[PDB]
């Protein structure tokens, strides 16, 4: 009984798993536990939770807690997360990241754009066109449209 009371004294860390009739989905639960287990907002220790949220599709969780306004998100902080979201096709997440004070003009770089284009999926049509043709994107557009 004393052990149970001691556990309750620090219930901020414990989190139950809702089966929800074979839910088999708890990434949101992990994120919720991680956020509720931090408390202090310094904007330098919350990057890992943000990266995890990007790796998953828990945009709602990140918005509710990570971008609830309590934390002071900087500009350079979100560069890597935005790049990851772009590479993995996270539309809602990229919209959220850009929404919260991210300067695209200072972000996009020739190297960044080259990587984005190199993210073409395996032997995709765009990949074939790029190989046939630095991003080297003007030539492909001129070939397609006609350059006239």
Contact footprint for other proteins (CB under 8 A): 41, 67-70, 72, 98-103
Confirm if 108 and 89 have CB atoms less than 8 A apart: no
By a kind-dependent CB cut-off of 5 to 8 A, residue 45 interacts, out of other proteins, Ca ion, none, with: Ca ion
By a kind-dependent CB cut-off of 5 to 8 A, residue 53 interacts, out of other proteins, Ca ion, none, with: none
CB of 10 to other proteins, least distance (A): 17
Other C-beta atoms closer than 10 Å to the C-beta of 96 total 22
Closest CA relative to residue 50, chosen from 18, 11, 96: 96
Confirm if 61 and 53 have CB atoms less than 8 A apart: yes
Q: Looking at 45, 87, 111, 126, which residue binds Ca ion (CB under 5 A)?
A: 45
The answer to whether the annotation marks 74 as part of a ligand binding site is yes
Confirm if 37 and 13 have CB atoms less than 8 A apart: yes
* Closer residue to other proteins, CB minimum distance, 99 or 124: 99
Closest CA relative to residue 80, chosen from 105, 34, 48, 120: 48
CB of 54 to Ca ion, least distance (A): 14
> Which residues form the interface with Ca ion (CB under 5 A)?
45
- Numbered residues of the known binding site: 45, 48-49, 74, 101
- Numbered residues of the known binding site for ATP: 74, 101
């Amino acid at each position: 009984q004393a052990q149970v009371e001691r556990i309750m004294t620090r219930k901020e860390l414990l989190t139950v798993y809702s089966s929800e009739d074979g839910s088999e989905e708890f990434e949101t639960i992990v994120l919720k536990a991680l956020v509720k287990a931090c408390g202090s907002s310094e904007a330098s220790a919350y990057l890992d939770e943000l990266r995890l949220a990007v790796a998953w599709n828990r945009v709602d969780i990140a918005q509710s807690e990570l971008f609830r306004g309590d934390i002071q998100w900087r500009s350079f902080h979100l560069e890597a997360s935005l790049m990851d979201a772009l590479l993995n096709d996270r539309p809602e997440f990229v919209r959220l990241l850009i929404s919260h004070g991210l300067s695209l003009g200072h972000f996009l770089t020739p190297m960044r754009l080259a990587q984005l284009y190199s993210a073409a999926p395996s032997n995709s049509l765009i990949r074939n066109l790029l190989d046939q043709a630095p991003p080297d994107v003007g030539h492909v557009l001129r070939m397609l449209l006609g350059k006239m």
